[PDB]
Amino acid sequence: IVGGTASVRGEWPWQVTLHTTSPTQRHLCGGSIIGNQWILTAAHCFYGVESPKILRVYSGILNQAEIKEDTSFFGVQEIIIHDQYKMAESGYDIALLKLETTVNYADSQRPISLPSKGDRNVIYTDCWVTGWGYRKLRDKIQNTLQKAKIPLVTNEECQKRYRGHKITHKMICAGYREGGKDACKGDSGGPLSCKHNEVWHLVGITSWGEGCAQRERPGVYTNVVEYVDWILEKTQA
Amino acid sequence: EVCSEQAETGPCRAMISRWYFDVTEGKCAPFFYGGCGGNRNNFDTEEYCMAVCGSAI
């Protein structure tokens, strides 16, 4: 995360850290707990990943340092990627990670509610992007989960910032006109939590963006509300 | 070309360990790929990268 500040323990209960063990153990992506056995994340995060056996999901984490050989984690039983996904830039960059066992909700790890097409007068004005990503193009994974308040920008306005891509309705952008704050390398898969009516809604999934926190270059996230039907369907037996 | 392009991470924000052929060094080297975009000089393993761009083995 760029232009943000250190988060406090237990602040973002739904935020997890996805690790890969190949070739060695390291933070690969972020992800959100939406079910006691379901992590919503980005499809491109598994680029190259042949088997979910090398995956590790760590809940209730604040400092990457907390991860050790003895540290408990959740194994992934199956990687579910949207059947229409081709290229993160084009959209459909969404994936479900089905854990082998269930999570026990606690103050340090809980599910974040999904948006609903049935919601009324939805106006997100309290959005936050979280993750252990870079703090500046060409950096390194952070130890402490970083957060940053970022304003949503309309699809139209964003379409103008990205004359190279086709910002579809299934995407959502966020960022200041002058930049300074945004998600960066390592935050993909992370949640884009926004306050609706005293309740947190997983509005978007960290997907991409030209550079990191560049002016007139907003972060692009997968627009979750547009996939709720997919999620419910895929989460169903 | 495929073995002469600079390692480009791409617009995606993931941490994917990959390999690219460095012309200066005359050998393959690691680099973090974002997950999407980039160019053909992007391989999963050192051996594969060397198999495509490496010298007479």
Under 8 Å between Cβ of B13 and A133: yes
Q: Does residue A129 share a domain with residue A83?
A: no
A162 annotated among ligand-binding-site residues: yes
- Report CA dihedral (A197, A200, A204, A209) to the nearest 10 degrees: 100
Q: Are residues A67 and A177 in the same domain?
A: no
How many Å apart are CA A66 and CA A48, to the nearest integer?
27
The whole-angstrom separation of Cα B27 and Cα B23 is 7
Nearest to A191 by CA among A125, A145, A157: A145
Any bridge partners for residue A56, and if so which?
Answer: A19, A75
Q: Which domains are delineated in chain B?
A: 1-57 (4.10.410.10)
Q: Coil, helix or strand for A50?
A: coil
Does one domain contain both A116 and A206?
yes
Q: A103 with A18, same domain? A: yes
Q: Which residues of B touch A188 (CB under 8 A)?
A: 12-15, 34-35
Nearest partner of A73 among A122, A117, A28, A120, judged by Cα: A28
Q: How far is CA A198 from CA A10, A44, A45, A194, B23, in A?
A: 17, 32, 31, 10, 55
**Would you call A182 a catalytic residue per the annotation?**
no
DSSP B1-25: --SSSPP---SB---EEEEEEETTT
Q: Is A153 on the interface with B (CB under 8 A)?
A: no
- Give the number of other CB atoms < 10 A from CB of residue A107: 9
Sheet strand arrangement including A200-208: A5-6, A146-149, A127-131, A191-195, A200-208, A219-223, A171-174, A152-153
Contact B31/B2 with Cβ under 8 angstroms? no
Query: Distance (Å, rounded) from C-alpha A29 to C-alpha A189?
Result: 6
Spell out which residues of chain B touch residue A23, defining contact as CB-CB under 8 Å. 17
User: A69: which 2 tokens?
Assistant: 């050989």
Lookup: tokens for A85: 């996904």
Statement to judge: residues A142 and A90 lie in one domain? no
Burial profile A179-217: b = 16 or more Cβ within 10 angstroms, e = fewer:
bebbbbbbbbbbbbbbebeeebbbbbbbbbbeebbbeeb
Do residue B36 and residue A47 have CB atoms under 8 angstroms apart?
yes
Contact assignment for A28 to B14 by CB distance below 8 Å = yes
Is A105 marked as a binding-site residue? no
Residues forming a β-bridge with A201: A113, A194
Host domain of residue A28: 13-111+227-237
> Resolution limit in angstroms?
2.6
A231 phi and psi, to 5 degrees? -55, -50
In this structure, the answer to whether residues A164 and A96 fall within a common structural domain is: no
Give which of B13, B15, B46 to mutate to test A binding, by max A Cβ within 10 Å: B13
CATH number of the structural domain spanning residue A219: 2.40.10.10
Q: What is the DSSP letter of A52?
A: G
Q: Is A161 annotated for ligand binding?
A: yes
Closest-approach residue (CA) in chain A for B9: A185
Which of B8, B15, B49 would you mutate first to test chain A, the one with the most A CBs within 10 A? B15
Does A135 show up as a binding residue in the annotation? no
Q: Do A173 and A60 lie in a common domain?
A: no
Please check whether residues A155 and A124 belong to one and the same domain: yes
If asked whether residues A18 and A82 sit together in one domain, one would say yes
Residue A93 a catalytic site member: yes
Tell whether A84 and A154 lie within a shared domain: no
Tell me, yes or no, whether A231 and A195 share the same domain. no
Same domain, A220 and A232: no
Specify the number of domains making up chain A: 2
Runs of H (alpha helix) within chain A? 155-161, 228-235
Is there a contact between A210 and B11 if contact means CB atoms under 8 Å apart? yes
Cβ partners under 8 Å of residue A177, min gap 6: A215, A216
Q: Does a cis peptide bond (omega within 30 degrees of 0) precede residue A23?
A: yes
Please list the residues that pair with B30 across neighbouring strands: B19
- Is the CB of residue A180 less than 8 Å from the CB of residue A42? no
